[PDB]
């Protein structure tokens, strides 16, 4: 898909070597918005392309939920896993259309 | 498991309230015109269906099918045959759509549900037991009802050492399990055919 | 954070057992009859223990 | 003898030792020895080029299962007997069949042409090559065809004709042939799924194969919906028509896999909550408060769009969620009117204006709504939904109540039991029961109670199938009790006859009372003394008691628990995938409320260039879709696959051929 | 904004020469790794002990990728060996002999020695090589011991001690070690399965691993019996004793080895012993089986007196057949039940006698049989111990029934000797009435023993066994029911007991023609709420004779709420739980029935108790048996390890490691060819 960066796909295939060479190149993913963020951008992207925005959010939260990216770039992987599981459960509560995927990532 | 199971019952009683509400409306519309008063006495009589809350009371006790409400409550005191027979048919249809249909549907739903919880049963029980244990681990209230900074940096450094060790061990264990669990697919066969053909072509080119 | 798998792990549950049982870590080593009568004999004189604390 | 002698009764063909060495060297993938063997086979030798094993393994066929391109080229070079080896190359799923394309018993059916086997194997490159060579499949007849020639062919060989039709329909239902040869693969998938369903209905045998084919076609349509990646592409596909016309077609053809797509449900939820964002994000109490204040203020929005349609309050009814909220607020208002109608002493009733006069038109609006539903769909669409049948009997009872009240108007404890007032009141009560049971169909909109209602609705058929057997048992035992107990029909001194008395008597005197008593015996509401006659004949009393006992055993212990077990299995099979059924029903509700017709609730309802542009847009986007789909199934088929014995045979034979080539070189 | 990704765990990525070294190591080129080592002798950036942040070394990769010449080359060049031997044993590679004789984030527990990991991997050759070299396993302590070492290790490091105990028990319970080093692998398997069961019961943590280990030991014993191929081997296995006996079979029954006993060969031997001297009893028509069972049942006393007179007689030896002995015992019990059934009906006397004299009709014939039962239960209490008596619920019910019969006899002789008048004038606690009621309860306990007689039948023995399995889960749920019943009963009593009335009524309580004072006391409230499950309590018990409508409504609401619970929630939960329980135990019903039937068979196999219930009242031989058992069991162990290795070559499994193995092998061959040619 056109919204997928190499580091997001690298986190999708969950390989530690590809991660440990890719993050050496100073790579940062976009920050996903909140559970109910309806700002000037978030209310406009849903108007623009709802499916593209939903797939971008799912790809980002699949990239962050990989164990390799948690264990490489965070101060506390246990705390990041806890917060990410809680956030993913809340998103699966909110996002009715992709309950199985967000529940699986949690 | 029963505490997890109660939501199925919540949904089933949500449907049963609407079914009960329909018949209660039908019976108290049919029997409205026609000592002990009501249903809670020896001679149950026709006064069960006179009031709306009395009709809900009478149709509440029919679900057990154990002679809680005798069928002479459906007989008119004025002796009208057709209204009494239609009331009997209505209460029979209630005893069919419940007891015979809804209760056994509930039994099937609970059978599938208890098949579903039972695999994640020990983990849930241990989690609830640990919740109670950590509720009782505090020094906040030890009596029964009737009686009722560089150190942070050192702790963070110790935690970083322990977590670095844990990350190393989990990475090694994850790659060990990954290499010992996945099955070979046809694409790996295709790479092996490629290596064989590349051998054969290099042999032909060299010789 | 409602982590069911984190707390059901054998190591975490074992640590919780050692914290929970307190001084008498051999209570698990006791037979079931001895555990029963120990629970009973603490259940009788509980106001004495509360008052002495 | 104490030993069983063993021999080959069907000895079949036998091979020369030189022929066996030739075949074994072909199996080893040898260049030099096989080439030399065919060279001596050119001159007059024992070695025959067209050597066939009794296993049906010709050197041609062995090399096809050997996949060695050089060996198969060598064998076609000296013109071996080419029989069905093309079909063997098709089955093996090897691209080397183009070499045979460029160039006794049969393991395949005589009907099987290369395209049918290519579609069965579902390889994109092979089917592409076969259709590039130029190939037309045979035409299957219609699902209810009438051909004299096909009837005569069925009379000659019914088995071969049925196998031929099954093979043709299996070739057409292949996803690769649909994606490669059809103008509109979504329309082709829909029509083929419907044809396969009706074929499984007509052909009771071979029903599992046709059901598998139909499910495969539905899975193909769902995958082709999966490959989309833009809301623009969804709006091109679902709104295509030759308005969500394609979604209407999916609704009509019962494509629950297509309809319950997460992207399609995303579009449907966007269209249902028209300009209503953050409804799921807001609190449950907050959104129920908003629903309650929209439904409480229902007359002001419904009076609008009737006088001022272009007003913002008039355009508030345009949103389908507001339309559904207004409709259900109207229905709970109707049930509130019925409740107050439930809560004088005249032969004919004057019309009770206080609460029972505004029901008359609302029933008339209900009748007008059902007539409008009758116009939109014909007779099969109305009888297809059981809820339309329930609405039909509800309106029939209400019309009969009105007619009986009118008949009473133009014409207690004193009237005949067939007075139109009493029958009108009873019919009104049963119509009230049906009208209040109508509320359970609104649970499809809710997420918690939706799958519950749908699972109950499609297990009602199994319930009825059990109740037929219960009806037979009930009739048998009632006939027996009638024959036994009808000589003791009491006639004198009874203040109350039948089972519906304070003292039960005459329970089994007639057939109708016996049916009622045996029905009520399930719930334990018939006491044991109804089997005691006034006479002294204790043997007939005991036979009646044991007959009642055996019935009670059969109904309560045996048949009821059998119903429990059958319900267990049925609910397992239904709640395996009931979520797609629930989403299909919710989409049916939403799209029934998407129409511009019926915007008013039952209270107040009483070019070629554009077609070419749409066709080209749909075509381009679906070239993109089929490209993504074939890339996806090529990627999927390359992984999570077992190698099994054939891949090991190929991989070992390559090393064997390489070793023999190296030994020839060195 | 954007989430920054800074690598927190800093690992050195090493020199490019080290990466070329590692690439030559997995890539399989023998020439490049040798040239790299020769270059590394000058001590530039490449090091022989380079450790890759994934956690692999050149030696470790050479271990993971076989090619024993590569490990030989690296071991000749002084590569550090910290745990490469342990990774060789974990990899199940037989080339660990090179690390054996030639030359903390360790990815292993510090407890784990080579022999522990060897037994964990269950590789016969590696364990054989390690024991041949000379290696030993630390001895675990008792399951329940309060010794100083165990508690000291628990206070120092509880997790390390528990993991060490688990690893030791996982090493001892391996089939290969047991088959190689244990002198008596059958007894070792039995004792280890029992000890692991006690460890699972005591240590609630790590319970799944312990029950899996016990299941593995039972699997090992079953497979070892499945490797027999002769009757004499089975006879010398089952009759072997530590110091027709079937001592090993008794000990296996004691240790609850279900699938051991339910093996087809053991069943065949036990069925051959069960139908002793029978020319094909099973090869019979079922009608002929029924009539012949009837005629052995009828002639029970003549066989009994034939054994009492002449033990050497053919009829006196007819009872020694265990099937005929079982038939005669069932005939005695059925005659006892028929005597009680006649005692209910033959009695036609005044039934008014003050003391109830013991008649000659049924009494003095029930009395001996009762004391024969008492003597038999005393004998089974003495023989087999008290624990075996209380293990079976059937013996507990038999003891209760015998105690009730003794109480009835004592009360009857008390009424004979004291208080010896119309029947309605008797007190409610008269000794004769208490004797009557205790005889009735003993009779309903005695007539249920025929269910224990039903394990022998093939068609319904598994059914009775499955009901016996899920009766425990029934009691498990009845505890929750008891809590609900106590809650609602004492609530309803606290409501209605202010409205207690008598009014001189003929009957009080629920068991009257008209129910009254149902929720009066706690006993009556518990009785009334119990009977409401079965609908025998009418709805007119909830209203009071006064006109307090609110208390009547809330009492009816509490009664209806309890009825809703115990008739919709708890009963249907019980149905679903029973459904899942019978689904779980349907697969294990056959082996459970076979184990129970063999216990019932071997109850009658002993010499004692031959008389029925009417008449209940050396070193050279040991060395020869030891040598026969040793040679037969050595043959069994050899057959089992051959079959286990063959199954290891049979299981349909190919990981991604072996594709990488073939890829590395063919690449190494190619690079050797290109170096040569
Ligand atoms: C709803 N209903 C009812 O109300 N009455 C009471 C009428 C006055 O007492 C009835 O007698 C009555 C009844 N349905 C009845 O047949 C059933 C058929 C199938 C299933 C079923 O359900 C269940 F399996 F039993 F659970 C019931 N019968 C028996 C009957 C009566 C007359 C005739 Cl012609 C034919 C059959
Ligand atoms: C059909 N039947 C019956 O009608 N009566 C009433 C007769 C007049 O009251 C009975 O008493 C009666 C009866 N079947 C009976 O035994 C059953 C055996 C097995 C199953 C069963 O089914 C269920 F499990 F219970 F569901 C019932 N018994 C009890 C009985 C009575 C006398 C004698 Cl000698 C032997 C047995
Ligand atoms: C607890 N309870 C109760 O105690 N009584 C007896 C009170 C004195 O008679 C009732 O009549 C009574 C009752 N719950 C009732 O509704 C139910 C709710 C939930 C479950 C249920 O049952 C089942 F689980 F689905 F099977 C039934 N009703 C019926 C009712 C009566 C009046 C009114 Cl306004 C509304 C409902
Ligand atoms: Ca409709
Ligand atoms: Ca006993
Ligand atoms: Zn935003
Ligand atoms: Zn035709
Ligand atoms: Zn110790």
UniProtKB/Swiss-Prot annotation, chain A:
Describe how it is modified after translation.
Activation of PRKCA induces phosphorylation of TRPC1 and subsequent Ca2+ entry into cells.
Which positions does UniProt annotate for Zn(2+) binding? 33, 37, 39, 42
Q: Where are the ANK repeats?
A: 2-24
Q: Where in the cell is the protein located?
A: Cell membrane
Query: What tissues is it present in?
Result: Seems to be ubiquitous.
Self-association state and partner proteins as the record states: Heterotetramer with TRPC4 and/or TRPC5. Forms a heteromeric ion channel with TRPC4, with a 1:3 TRPC1:TRPC4 stoichiometry. Unlike other TRP channel proteins, does not form a homomeric channel. Interacts with TRPC4AP. Interacts with ITPR3. Interacts with MX1 and RNF24. Interacts with FKBP4. Interacts with PLSCR1. Interacts with PKD2L2. Forms a heterotetramer with PKD2 with a 2:2 stoichiometry; has distinct channel properties separate from PKD2 or TRPC1 homomers alone.
The similarity annotation says: Belongs to the transient receptor (TC 1.A.4) family. STrpC subfamily. TRPC1 sub-subfamily.
Summary of the function given for this chain in its UniProt record:
Forms a receptor-activated non-selective calcium permeant cation channel. Forms a heteromeric ion channel with TRPC4 or TRPC5 that has reduced calcium permeability compared to the homomeric TRPC4 or TRPC5 channel. Also permeable to monovalent ions including sodium, lithium and cesium ions.
What name appears for this protein in its UniProt entry?
A: Short transient receptor potential channel 1
Organism, per UniProt? Homo sapiens (Human)
The part of the entire sequence present here spans 157 to 262 of 793
UniProtKB/Swiss-Prot annotation, chain C:
Tissue specificity as recorded in UniProt: Seems to be ubiquitous.
Segments dipping into the membrane without crossing: 31-53
Q: Which domain of life is it from?
A: Eukaryota
Q: Where in the cell is it found?
A: Cell membrane
PTM per UniProt? Activation of PRKCA induces phosphorylation of TRPC1 and subsequent Ca2+ entry into cells.
Q: How does it assemble?
A: Heterotetramer with TRPC4 and/or TRPC5. Forms a heteromeric ion channel with TRPC4, with a 1:3 TRPC1:TRPC4 stoichiometry. Unlike other TRP channel proteins, does not form a homomeric channel. Interacts with TRPC4AP. Interacts with ITPR3. Interacts with MX1 and RNF24. Interacts with FKBP4. Interacts with PLSCR1. Interacts with PKD2L2. Forms a heterotetramer with PKD2 with a 2:2 stoichiometry; has distinct channel properties separate from PKD2 or TRPC1 homomers alone.
Known function: Forms a receptor-activated non-selective calcium permeant cation channel. Forms a heteromeric ion channel with TRPC4 or TRPC5 that has reduced calcium permeability compared to the homomeric TRPC4 or TRPC5 channel. Also permeable to monovalent ions including sodium, lithium and cesium ions.
What family classification does the UniProt entry report for this protein?
Belongs to the transient receptor (TC 1.A.4) family. STrpC subfamily. TRPC1 sub-subfamily.
Q: What is this protein called?
A: Short transient receptor potential channel 1
Q: Which organism is it from?
A: Homo sapiens
From Swiss-Prot, chain E:
What are the start and end residues of each intramembrane segment? 285-319
Q: Which residues form a coiled coil?
A: 192-229
The segments annotated as topological domain Cytoplasmic are 1-284, 320-322, 379-392, 457-469
Residues reported in the UniProt entry to bind Zn(2+)? 141, 145, 147, 150
What's in the keyword line of the UniProt record? ANK repeat, Calcium, Calcium channel, Calcium transport, Cell membrane, Coiled coil, Disulfide bond, Ion channel, Ion transport, Membrane, Phosphoprotein, Repeat, Transmembrane, Transmembrane helix, Transport
What outcome follows a substitution of residue 107 to K? In a breast cancer sample; somatic mutation
Listed binding positions for Ca(2+) are 377, 380, 395, 398
Tissue expression from the record:
Strongly expressed in placenta. Expressed at lower levels in heart, pancreas, kidney and brain. Expressed in endothelial cells. Isoform alpha was found to be the predominant isoform. Isoform beta was not found in pancreas and brain.
User: How, per the record, is this protein's activity regulated?
Assistant: May be operated by a phosphatidylinositol second messenger system activated by receptor tyrosine kinases or G-protein coupled receptors. May be activated by intracellular calcium store depletion. Inhibited by xanthine-based inhibitor Pico145.
Q: How is it modified after translation?
A: Phosphorylation modulates TRPC channel function by regulating the level of TRPC4 at the cell surface and by increasing the association with NHERF1.
Membrane spanning stretches: 323-343, 364-378, 393-413, 434-456, 470-492, 558-578
GO molecular function terms noted in the UniProt entry: beta-catenin binding; cadherin binding; calcium channel activity; inositol 1,4,5 trisphosphate binding; store-operated calcium channel activity
Which Cys residues form disulphide pairs?
Answer: 507-512
Q: Which family does it belong to?
A: Belongs to the transient receptor (TC 1.A.4) family. STrpC subfamily. TRPC4 sub-subfamily.
Miscellaneous comment: The interaction with spectrin is important in controlling the translocation of TRPC4 channels to the plasma membrane following EGF stimulation. The cell membrane presentation, the calcium entry function and the interaction with junctional proteins (CTNNB1 and CDH5) are controlled by endothelial cell-cell contacts.
Please give the name of this protein. Short transient receptor potential channel 4
Organism taxonomic ancestry: Eukaryota, Metazoa, Chordata, Craniata, Vertebrata
Name of the coding gene: TRPC4
């Amino acid at each position: 898909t056109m919204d997928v960066a190499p580091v997001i796909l690298a986190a999708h295939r969950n390989n530690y070597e590809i991660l440990t060479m890719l993050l050496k190149q100073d790579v940062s993913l976009p920050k996903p918005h909140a559970v109910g963020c309806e700002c000037t951008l978030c209310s406009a992207k849903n108007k623009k392309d709802s499916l593209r925005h939903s797939r971008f959010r799912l790809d980002i939260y699949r990239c962050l939920a990989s164990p390799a990216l948690i264990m490489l770039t965070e101060e506390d992987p246990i705390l990041r896993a806890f917060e990410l599981s809680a956030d993913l459960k809340e998103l699966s509560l909110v996002e009715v259309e992709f309950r199985n995927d967000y529940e699986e990532l949690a | 498991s029963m505490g997890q199971m109660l939501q199925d019952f919540g949904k089933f009683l949500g449907m049963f309230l609407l079914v009960l509400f329909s018949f209660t409306i039908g019976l108290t519309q049919l029997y409205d015109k026609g000592d002990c008063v009501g249903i809670f006495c020896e001679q149950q009589s026709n006064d069960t269906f006179h009031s709306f809350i009395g009709t809900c009371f009478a149709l509440f006790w029919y679900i057990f099918s154990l002679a809680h409400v005798a069928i002479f409550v459906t007989r008119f005191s004025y002796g009208e045959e057709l209204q009494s027979f239609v009331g009997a048919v209505i209460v029979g249809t209630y005893n069919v759509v419940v007891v015979i249909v809804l209760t056994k549907l509930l039994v099937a739903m609970l059978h599938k549900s208890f098949q579903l919880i039972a695999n994640h049963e020990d983990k849930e029980w241990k989690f609830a037991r640990a919740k109670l244990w950590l509720s009782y681990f505090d020094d906040k209230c030890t009596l029964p009802p009737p009686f009722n900074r560089n150190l942070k940096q050192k702790r963070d450094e110790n935690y970083q050492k322990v977590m670095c060790c844990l990350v190393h061990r989990y990475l090694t264990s994850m790659r060990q399990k990954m290499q010992s669990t996945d099955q070979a697919t046809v694409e790996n066969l295709n790479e092996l055919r490629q290596d064989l053909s590349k051998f054969r072509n290099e042999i032909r080119d060299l010789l | 954070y409602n982590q069911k798998e984190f707390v059901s792990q054998s190591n975490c549950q074992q640590f919780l057992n050692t914290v929970w049982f307190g001084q008498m870590s051999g209570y698990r080593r006791k037979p079931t009859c001895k555990k029963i009568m120990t629970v009973l004999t603490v259940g009788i004189f509980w106001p004495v223990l509360s008052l002495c604390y | 003898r104490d030993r069983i002698p063993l021999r080959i009764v069907r000895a079949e063909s036998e091979l020369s030792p030189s022929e066996k060495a030739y075949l074994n060297a072909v199996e080893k993938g040898d260049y030099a020895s096989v080439k030399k063997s065919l060279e001596e086979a050119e001159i007059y030798f024992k070695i025959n080029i067209n050597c066939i094993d009794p296993l049906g393994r010709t050197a041609l066929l062995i090399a096809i299962e050997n996949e060695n391109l050089e060996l198969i080229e060598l064998l076609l070079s000296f013109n071996v007997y080419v029989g069905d080896a093309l079909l063997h190359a098709i089955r093996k799923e090897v691209v080397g069949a183009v070499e045979l394309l460029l160039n006794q018993f049969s393991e395949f059916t005589p009907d099987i042409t290369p395209i049918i086997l290519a579609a069965h194997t579902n390889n994109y490159e092979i089917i592409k090559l076969l259709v590039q060579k130029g190939v037309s499949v045979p035409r299957p007849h219609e699902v209810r065809c009438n051909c004299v020639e096909c009837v005569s062919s069925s009379d000659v060989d019914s088995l071969r004709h049925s196998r031929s039709r099954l093979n043709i329909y299996k070739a057409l239902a292949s996803p690769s042939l649909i994606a490669l040869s059809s103008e509109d693969p979504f329309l082709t998938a829909f029509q083929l799924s419907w044809e396969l369903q009706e074929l499984s209905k007509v052909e009771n045998e071979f029903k599992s194969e046709y059901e598998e084919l139909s499910r495969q076609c539905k899975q193909f349509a769902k995958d082709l919906l999966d490959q989309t990646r833009s809301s623009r592409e969804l709006e091109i596909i679902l709104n295509y028509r030759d308005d969500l016309a394609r979604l209407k077609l999916a609704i009509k053809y019962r494509q629950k896999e297509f309809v319950a797509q997460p992207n399609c449900q995303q579009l449907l939820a966007s269209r249902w909550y028209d300009e209503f964002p953050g409804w799921r994000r807001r609190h449950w109490a907050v959104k129920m408060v908003t629903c309650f204040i929209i439904g409480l203020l229902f007359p002001v929005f419904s009076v609008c769009y009737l006088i001022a349609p272009k007003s913002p309050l008039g355009l508030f009814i345009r949103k389908p969620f507001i339309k559904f909220i207004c409709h259900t607020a109207s229905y709970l208002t109707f049930l509130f009117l019925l409740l107050l109608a439930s809560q004088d002493l005249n032969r004919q009733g004057p019309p009770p204006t206080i609460v029972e006069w505004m029901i008359l038109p609302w029933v008339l609006g209900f009748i007008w709504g059902e007539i409008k539903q009758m116009w939109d769909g014909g007779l099969q669409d109305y009888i297809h939904d059981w809820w339309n049948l329930m609405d039909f009997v509800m309106n029939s009872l209400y019309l009969a109540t009105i007619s009986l009240k009118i008949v009473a108007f133009v014409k207690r404890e004193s009237w005949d039991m067939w007075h139109p007032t009493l029958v009108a009141e009873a019919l009104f009560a049963i119509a009230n029961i049906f009208s209040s049971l109508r509320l359970i169909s609104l649970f499809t909109a809710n997420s918690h109670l939706g799958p519950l209602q749908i699972s109950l609705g499609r297990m009602l058929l199994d319930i009825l199938k059990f109740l037929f057997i219960y009806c037979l048992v009930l009739l048998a035992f009632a006939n027996g009790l009638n024959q036994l107990y009808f000589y003791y029909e009491e006639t004198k001194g009874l203040t109350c006859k039948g089972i519906r008395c304070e003292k039960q008597n005459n329970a089994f005197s007639t057939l109708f009372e016996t049916l009622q008593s045996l029905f009520w015996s399930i719930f334990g509401l018939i006491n044991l003394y109804v089997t005691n006659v006034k006479a002294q004949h204790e043997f007939t009393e005991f036979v009646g008691a044991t007959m009642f006992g055996t019935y009670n055993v059969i109904s309560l212990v045996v048949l009821l628990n059998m119903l429990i077990a059958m319900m267990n299995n049925s609910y397992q099979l239904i709640a395996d995938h009931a979520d797609i059924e629930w989403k299909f029903a919710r989409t049916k509700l939403w799209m029934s409320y998407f129409e511009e017709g019926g915007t008013l609730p039952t209270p107040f309802n009483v070019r070629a260039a554009d077609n070419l542009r749409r066709h080209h847009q749909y075509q381009e986007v679906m070239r993109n879709l089929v490209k993504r789909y074939v890339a996806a199934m090529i990627r999927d088929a390359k992984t999570e696959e077992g190698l099994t014995e054939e891949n090991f045979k190929e991989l070992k034979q390559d090393i064997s051929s390489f070793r023999f080539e190296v030994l020839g070189l060195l």
